[PDB]
């Protein structure tokens, strides 16, 4: 990483994903969202996990 910019974005990226997995095997907090273009980015949010 290039430290201030990259570490923050990488950290928040993880923190999003972690949270949505861990409160739902089944509905509690249902998570909804959107993205404009999903192929301009490498998998993170487009992982089957």
């Amino acid at each position: 990483s290039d430290t201030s910019g990259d570490r923050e974005v990488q950290r928040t990226m993880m923190q999003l994903l972690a949270e949505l997995d861990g409160f739902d095997p089944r509905g509690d907090v249902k998570v909804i969202g959107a993205t404009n273009r999903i192929d301009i980015l490498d998998p993170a949010i487009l992982r089957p996990g």
Partner: protein, 49 residues
């Protein structure tokens, strides 16, 4: 350890290699370890003349 295959190869390359060494290192440090490596069709190649 699940290693993404999308992330592998770029239009000029260096980060695609970083993730090979990284999971290699991680695997050794924590053996036994099974590195799933999808997909060997985005890094498998054939020759040309």
């Amino acid at each position: 350890i699940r290693v993404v295959g999308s992330e592998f190869v770029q239009k000029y390359i260096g980060e695609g290699a970083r993730l090979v060494r990284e999971v290699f290192q991680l695997a050794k440090e924590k053996a036994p370890s099974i590195i799933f490596i999808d997909e060997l069709d985005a890094i498998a190649a054939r020759r040309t003349n």
